[PDB]
Write an enzyme that holds these catalytic residues in place. Structure first.
Site, mmCIF file in Angstrom:
data_model
loop_
_atom_site.group_PDB
_atom_site.id
_atom_site.type_symbol
_atom_site.label_atom_id
_atom_site.label_comp_id
_atom_site.label_asym_id
_atom_site.label_seq_id
_atom_site.Cartn_x
_atom_site.Cartn_y
_atom_site.Cartn_z
ATOM 1 C CE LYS B 62 33.447 41.846 -24.491
ATOM 2 N NZ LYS B 62 32.975 41.725 -23.126
ATOM 3 C CB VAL B 63 34.723 50.992 -23.065
ATOM 4 C CG1 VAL B 63 34.017 53.080 -23.056
ATOM 5 C CG2 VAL B 63 34.153 50.486 -22.012
ATOM 6 C CB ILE B 176 40.569 23.551 -19.369
ATOM 7 C CG1 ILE B 176 39.331 24.278 -18.387
ATOM 8 C CG2 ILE B 176 41.689 24.009 -18.704
ATOM 9 C CD1 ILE B 176 39.822 25.982 -18.084
#
Ligand code: BMP
Ligand code: BMP
Lengths: 214, 214
Positions: B62-63, B176
């Site tokens: 999560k830079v 899904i």
């Protein structure tokens, strides 16, 4: 009774890190340790730093995930650190997840508002006042707000009514004299490169500390 | 030619982590390793996992910092990982700083757009279309977009025209069947807890892989 000095220790080597801490400890009031150091050395560096300078150590991990993940990161981080920095933009629930962990451990939570770099203008700046309101709502310990934009730093601080830690002086072009009037004894000025990239970090830390005399 | 399965390996113990990887490797197509695991074990777990399953390993870090710090984080991370996840909200320059590192190393950069948790609505959702436009502009490799909001997932994917990795199925309530029609063989469905918290992760990974048959 002056603004305090927080070293941003973003070096990549444990030896260089410990050396800098030893050199600057008489002039710095807290150490901010981030992922550049921690990914290089492991979280163990935090306890080592703390034992070396006997100052507050804040983990600047820019925590920015979902609540469940934020909680895991906070639990690990606050075993070692005295406080942790979290992003507000990911939302209130994500901030609270970190707060809940920090409350049980009696540790500090610091929330990022507007950031100091040019890219902060794109998305952060337009909602930074609301981030500031959220920080006030959530009763976090402090906020991060930018030295590079003194008018915004003033505005953000006055909305939040919280202490600030403020980065941007030195490498990013911010100048102490332009923010000094805004800050008080409960605030920290963050300095990284201007101190750690110098040939004499002790002298530079001393210079910056004396610059905070107001 | 079906959507792929990416395990979110958010366990806190090296032994448990490696055991899960061994158990699920025949059914998973990539492994996402985050700070819950890495702060617990160190970056060395990334090479270990990679050797164990022979699949792509993405560092979900999560830079979210200034460009100079982002660059430091990217360089360390991509020594080990095949790709790295960066936030877009911190601005274009911060994303580019990571891209510049990854380009030199032939590694992948994946940008977060709208997140899957309730807090994402507060600040991320209102600008997620612009984040998507930025991802397209920057030519990142993929984006993260949420399973929990199928209509937004569709909208975001169609704006970016990029592959997605999508979290939210299982623990967060996503299903899904509700996203399957949106995805193709270049997309990954991220599943964490529903697989790693089970008494039989192999069986659950098998079930999830089979659920992607479309
Ligand atoms: O808005 C912000 C928020 C930060 O945490 N930081 C951090 O503050 C420090 C600033 O260091 P420097 O004085 O070397 O620019 C870095 O660790 C950086 O990641 C910042 O520069 N701007
Ligand atoms: O919007 C997002 C972005 C993420 O990276 N994630 C990540 O995806 C994973 C989801 O795992 P889980 O299936 O246990 O909810 C976690 O690692 C989480 O941090 C997410 O849940 N939502």
């Amino acid at each position: 009774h002056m603004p305090k000095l927080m070293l941003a220790l973003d070096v990549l080597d444990r030896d260089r890190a410990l050396k800098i801490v030893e050199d600057v400890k008489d002039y710095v009031d807290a150490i901010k340790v981030g992922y550049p150091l921690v990914l290089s050395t492991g979280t163990e560096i935090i306890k080592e730093i703390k034992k070396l300078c006997n100052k507050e150590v804040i983990a600047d991990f820019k925590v920015a995930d979902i609540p469940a993940t934020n909680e895991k990161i906070a639990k690990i981080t606050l075993k070692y650190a005295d406080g942790i920095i979290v992003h507000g933009f990911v939302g209130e629930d994500s901030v609270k997840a970190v707060q809940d962990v920090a409350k049980k451990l009696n540790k500090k939570v610091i929330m990022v508002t507007e950031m100091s770099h040019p890219g902060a203008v794109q998305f952060l700046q337009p909602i930074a006042d609301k981030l500031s309101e959220m920080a006030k709502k959530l009763k976090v310990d402090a906020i991060v707000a930018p030295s590079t934009r003194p008018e915004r730093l003033k505005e953000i601080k006055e909305i939040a009514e919280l202490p600030v830690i403020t980065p941007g002086v030195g490498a990013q072009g911010g100048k102490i004299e332009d923010i000094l009037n805004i800050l008080d004894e409960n605030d920290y000025v963050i300095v990284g490169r201007a101190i750690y990239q110098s040939q004499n970090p002790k002298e530079e830390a001393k210079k910056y500390k004396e610059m905070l005399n107001k």
